[PDB]
């Protein structure tokens, strides 16, 4: 079985940077190596074939080289739309085998999130469960701490985060933290707070609501 090993496995790089990504074939696959770009939740786009050749339509900042065991994809000048996972592929031998992919992240300047909190709808309390949502809008970098307090008491495990993909223009992220509690249990308490700690905030920012007002 021919292994294709890509390095690095992920990387963060600024608009304008020159990005190089390698791919080592487990043995001599000569020049029978192709490269693909995949934006998340979308079909791959073919970039390079026979190691060094630009498939139709692909911008000239993309280019490939290598032979035998060792292969390179370069993006000479990263654009903000170029975040994606990049895969190499050998097809010298069956089975055809892909590298594990290199996820390329756009590095940008720090951007503080805008925070919002959403009480559960009565439309949902009418249903026995309760979802409180805290939104972190358009920030960079990805890493953030969302802490839920109820009547001020840090919660555990009744929380779940999800993060969007990088914005194709300004490279920011958005994030939601969901807190789930019982109808019974949401209404045994008053103040609902999610507290946000992010590089772009001097101090943690809290958005709150009282179950009443």
């Amino acid at each position: 079985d021919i292994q294709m090993t890509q390095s690095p496995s992920s990387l963060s790089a600024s608009v304008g940077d020159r990005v190089t990504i390698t791919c080592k074939a487990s043995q001599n696959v000569r020049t029978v190596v192709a490269w693909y770009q995949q934006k998340p939740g979308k079909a791959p786009k073919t970039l390079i074939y026979l190691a060094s050749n630009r498939h139709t339509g692909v911008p000239s900042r993309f280019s490939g080289s290598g032979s035998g065991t060792d292969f390179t994809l370069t993006i000479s000048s990263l654009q903000p739309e170029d975040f994606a996972t990049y895969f190499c592929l050998q097809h010298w031998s069956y089975p055809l085998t892909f590298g594990q992919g290199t996820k390329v992240e756009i590095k940008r300047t720090v951007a503080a999130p805008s925070v919002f909190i959403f009480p559960p709808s009565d439309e949902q309390l009418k249903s026995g469960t309760a979802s409180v949502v805290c939104l972190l809008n358009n920030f960079y970098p990805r890493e953030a701490k969302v802490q839920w307090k109820v009547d001020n008491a840090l919660q555990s495990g009744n929380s779940q985060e999800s993060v969007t993909e990088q914005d194709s223009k300004d490279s920011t992220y958005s994030l939601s933290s969901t807190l789930t509690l019982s109808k019974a249990d949401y209404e045994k308490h008053k103040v609902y707070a999610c507290e946000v700690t992010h590089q772009g905030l001097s101090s943690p920012v809290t958005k709150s609501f009282n179950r009443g007002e």
């Binding site: 050749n53 089975p95 979802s131």
Partner: protein, 213 residues
């Protein structure tokens, strides 16, 4: 222009069967090798099978030999994948792709195969309602569905800017949930109408929901 239209994916129980089809147009279909490539959620690309241009040689990933059959119909320009004895590792998005000068020159948008004994459950759609405000946000929660995926639209797709539809998170209950949110001028609120257009085709459910307190 190359078009590759996959279908036939869906929920199927372990040990079951599905047939995938890939309707090609805009290229001399029968001149080219055709392949299925798959991607299990969160994972990389994996070559499944290839059928030569004339139909006469087929190559399979070891994992699928004896369970999957790749085949093609020159009179309908369609590639097929008859998949039997389905197991959890077959869960993936399946893409078809011709080989021209490059393998996988072009890729379809994929069709999702989910191998599970769990049952199709449709979502609930709850407001995330706006609001001393500044210029605040709103949205919808799409709660407790299976299988993946749902689409969310704002104002039948007329609202595009500043929409974030978060990736689905799998809950403890085995059900998925997500939120779609949007930001908007505080003014717009009294006069403009905001409705999220949720579609869970796996259940043929189709909910359109307006928001505010």
């Amino acid at each position: 222009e190359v078009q590759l239209v996959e279908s036939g994916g869906g929920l199927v129980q372990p040990g079951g069967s599905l047939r995938l089809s890939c309707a090609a147009s805009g290229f001399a279909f029968s001149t080219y090798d055709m392949s299925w490539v798959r991607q299990a959620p969160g994972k990389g690309l994996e070559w499944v099978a290839t059928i030569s241009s004339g139909g006469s040689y087929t190559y399979y990933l070891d994992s699928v030999k004896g369970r999957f059959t790749i085949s093609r119909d020159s009179s309908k320009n369609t590639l097929y994948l008859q998949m039997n004895s389905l197991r959890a590792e077959d869960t993936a998005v399946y893409y078809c792709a011709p080989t021209t000068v490059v393998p996988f020159a072009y890729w379809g948008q994929g069709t999702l195969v989910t191998v599970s004994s769990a049952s199709t459950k449709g979502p609930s759609v709850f407001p995330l309602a706006p609001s001393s405000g500044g210029t605040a946000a709103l949205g919808c929660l799409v709660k407790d569905y299976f299988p993946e995926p749902v689409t969310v639209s704002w104002n039948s797709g007329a609202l595009t800017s500043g929409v974030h539809t978060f990736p689905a998170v799998l809950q403890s209950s085995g059900l998925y949930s997500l939120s779609s949110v949007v930001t908007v001028p505080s003014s717009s609120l009294g006069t403009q109408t905001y409705i999220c257009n949720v579609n869970h085709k796996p259940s043929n459910t189709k909910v359109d929901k307006k928001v505010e307190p």
